[PDB]
């Protein structure tokens, strides 16, 4: 009787940026989704494919968890068939997504008096991102026709922009923690059932 270590990922002290989201693999344990579904502490709980109404009696081969931090206005962009800065340049989901996402407000931890500038996002890219693709490059973007030559100047901008978080900001400009769960199903023994 091994319990799935969900405490290490949901109750983690430090989270990752949206452009560098962390991925964790969970296997060979027993998971109780009823406790998570009855926490009354998550602002948003909406997902497609599987019904959250007590469907923990299913066996899956593996479970993958993705974590990142965004603001309130960009929470809607984390959904299949969505467009925006995040959906195109930072995190893209397939149209046939099979999983669930959990988001809650964390203004009491991630905010900082005077401004917290350690959270960044990508604003310039040559083309849209494919689903489940991670880009961590820091190459100087060429906006016009004059090559940047590795230096910043006219029509040469850094591809990353830093979030500005303050405790006095509005609800639409407050940090939010997002957790994404994915279920894999193959011709495998599928030891992850969680009765």
């Amino acid at each position: 009787t091994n319990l799935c270590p969900f405490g290490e990922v949901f109750n983690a002290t430090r989270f990752a940026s949206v452009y560098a989201w962390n991925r964790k693999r969970i296997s060979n344990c027993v998971a109780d989704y009823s406790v998570l579904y009855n926490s009354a502490s998550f602002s948003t709980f909406k997902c497609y494919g599987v019904s959250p109404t007590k469907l923990n009696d299913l066996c899956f081969t593996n479970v993958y968890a993705d974590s990142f931090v965004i603001r309130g206005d960009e929470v809607r962009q984390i959904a299949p068939g969505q467009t925006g800065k995040i959906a195109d340049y930072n995190y893209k989901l397939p149209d046939d997504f099979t999983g669930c996402v959990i988001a809650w407000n964390s203004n009491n931890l991630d905010s900082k008096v005077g401004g917290n500038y350690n959270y960044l996002y990508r604003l310039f890219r040559k083309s849209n991102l494919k689903p489940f693709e991670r880009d961590i490059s820091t190459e100087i973007y060429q906006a016009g026709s004059t090559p940047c030559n590795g230096v910043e100047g006219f029509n040469c901008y850094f591809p990353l922009q830093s979030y500005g978080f303050q405790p006095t900001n509005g609800v639409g400009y407050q940090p939010y923690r997002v957790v994404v769960l994915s279920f894999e199903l193959l011709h495998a023994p599928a030891t992850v059932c969680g009765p």
Partner: single-chain antibody
Amino acid sequence: QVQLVESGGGVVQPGRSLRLSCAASGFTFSNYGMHWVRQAPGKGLEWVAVISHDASNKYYADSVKGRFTISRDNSKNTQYLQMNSLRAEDTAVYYCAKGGGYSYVVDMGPYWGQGTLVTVSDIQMTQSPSSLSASVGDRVTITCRASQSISNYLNWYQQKPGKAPKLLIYDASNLETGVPSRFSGSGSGADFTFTIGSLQPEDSATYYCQQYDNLPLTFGGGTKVEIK
């Protein structure tokens, strides 16, 4: 019932072209993607190339760049690898591995083929010691350093002679099914340690450590363990 087989092996003179084929079964091949790994006789492992789930992003190694081409055909559950201008240092055993679904090209696990023999007639990981000897019931400790921070993105392999590598420890000391509790590990950041308890005669093999933090996959030097 996931199986992988190799085809197309042979002997060719330098300056010609050869093509290999790998067939997959037991899963949806259409939206996962595969890897290519080779191992020279008497040397370590080396990552070659990877393809996406829709044949839109292809990546190669520095030593095979410009001469190797990877192709996909989502109609027969087969994979193609085109080799041009083969040289003397291309004599190695080639394995086709299973990757991560969609555009996750940094996923790789316990899914290896039997391998084929072809003969022609960044982050740096250091592993120490290069060799080790012990008695029947000694304790074995292996260290695998890293060139930078890779977080918890390290796993360990075991390879018996004449056989494909076997995964024992994955994702920073998480045990895998069908593995005894004797094997264990610890570490995070840039320092990792692999530990073996009360040794047994059937533990004589070579162990490797490899990282999957970024696209260029790199392996460890290796350590041979024999009973004294």
